[PDB]
Structure formats: C-alpha cells, structure tokens
Amino acid sequence: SIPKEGENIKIQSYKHDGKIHRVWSETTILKGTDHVVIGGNDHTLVTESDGRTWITREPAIVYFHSEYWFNVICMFREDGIYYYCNLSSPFVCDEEALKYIDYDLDIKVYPNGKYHLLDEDEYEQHMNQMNYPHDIDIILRRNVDILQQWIEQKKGPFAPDFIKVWKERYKKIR
Ligand SMILES: [Mg+2]
Ligand SMILES: [Mg+2]
C-alpha cells in the first residue's frame, strides 16, 4: 500500500460508477510515504475507457495525496511546465496499481501561472447521472478552492523548487 522508490507502477483512474476511466501503464516511483506519492512517467502507454491507446509525448511528474481530493500531473513542454489537476478521491495503492476515482472537474495551469477551472458541465451531467452524494459535492467544491489557493501560493507541486528537485531526480533514474 506504500510503493517503493524505483518501483514501476500502473495508475488506474475510475468513475464513481466503478468503470475504468483512464490507465497509465508505467510510472517510476520517486517518493512513497503514508500521505504522498510522487512519480515520473515518459512515453507511457495510456488506455482509454473503450480500450483505445496512445503514448504520452513528454516527461511528467505525478503528485498524489491521501488527504486531498485532487492529484496533479506536471508536464515538461518546450515553453514550460503545464499542470493538469484532477479533482478526485484520494488514492489507494496495492500490488495492481495506484487507484483513484476521477470526479470530472479539472484545472489546467499554463506556464505563465494562469489557471482555468474546466469541466463544470461534465461534472453537472455526471453528478446527476451517477448520483454523487451531497457530501462528495461539498468536498469536491471545497477542494477546487483549496487547489486554486495552492496554485496561487505555489504550494506542493506548484513550488518551483518541487519541480527542480523531482525533475532532476526523475531525469537521473530514467
Ligand atoms: Mg479529470
Ligand atoms: Mg474532466
């Protein structure tokens, strides 16, 4: 339930109804504690809910937390660091994969710092279709605001020093 440094793990995201959403085949673990998992991936296979596949185009650092309802992908592109933030259940890890539930809402952060809250329409549809309970709705809306504050504070994976440390750590181990 705590992956080891240098372990190659699968990441499996689900929807609230239990169907798989998206699977990443290979992520190398850089840090594994009780609260935080940090990993790196680069040209990993990605599997869609219909089984269709594609391969990621650039290195990324992934950040997972046991007590926050979000996780963060930090993508290294030509014109800087992009963040893609999934509102989510907190993660659980076992011998199959690190697993979480994707809850539709996402935030994209551009290299200039500007962020956009995405998928309010997708969230409203799924919350009605899959009958998300009221307490999950409260938690998710409260975690959108926490994530915006973390981005504005440059907290956690949004810290420039976080990027420098884990980018260089992953470059060495790969
Ligand atoms: Mg998402
Ligand atoms: Mg979405």
Swiss-Prot record:
Changing D104A: Loss of activity. InterPro entries: DUF402 (IPR007295), FomD-like_sf (IPR035930), Ntdp-like (IPR050212), SA1684 (IPR016882). GTP binds at H21, R22, N41, Y84. The active site is at R22. Changing Y84A: Strong decrease in catalytic efficiency with GTP, GDP and ADP as substrate. Small decrease in catalytic efficiency with ATP as substrate. Changing W54A: Decreases catalytic efficiency with GDP and ADP as substrate. Keywords: Hydrolase, Magnesium, Metal-binding. It is an enzyme of class 3 (hydrolase). It comes from the Bacteria. Its cofactor is Mg(2+); Mn(2+); Co(2+). Mg(2+) 2 binds at D104, D106, D119, E122. It catalyses: a ribonucleoside 5'-triphosphate + H2O = a ribonucleoside 5'-diphosphate + phosphate + H(+); a ribonucleoside 5'-diphosphate + H2O = a ribonucleoside 5'-phosphate + phosphate + H(+); GTP + H2O = GDP + phosphate + H(+); ATP + H2O = ADP + phosphate + H(+). NCBIfam families: PRK13662.1. Monomer in solution. This is Nucleoside triphosphate/diphosphate phosphatase. It comes from Staphylococcus aureus (strain N315).
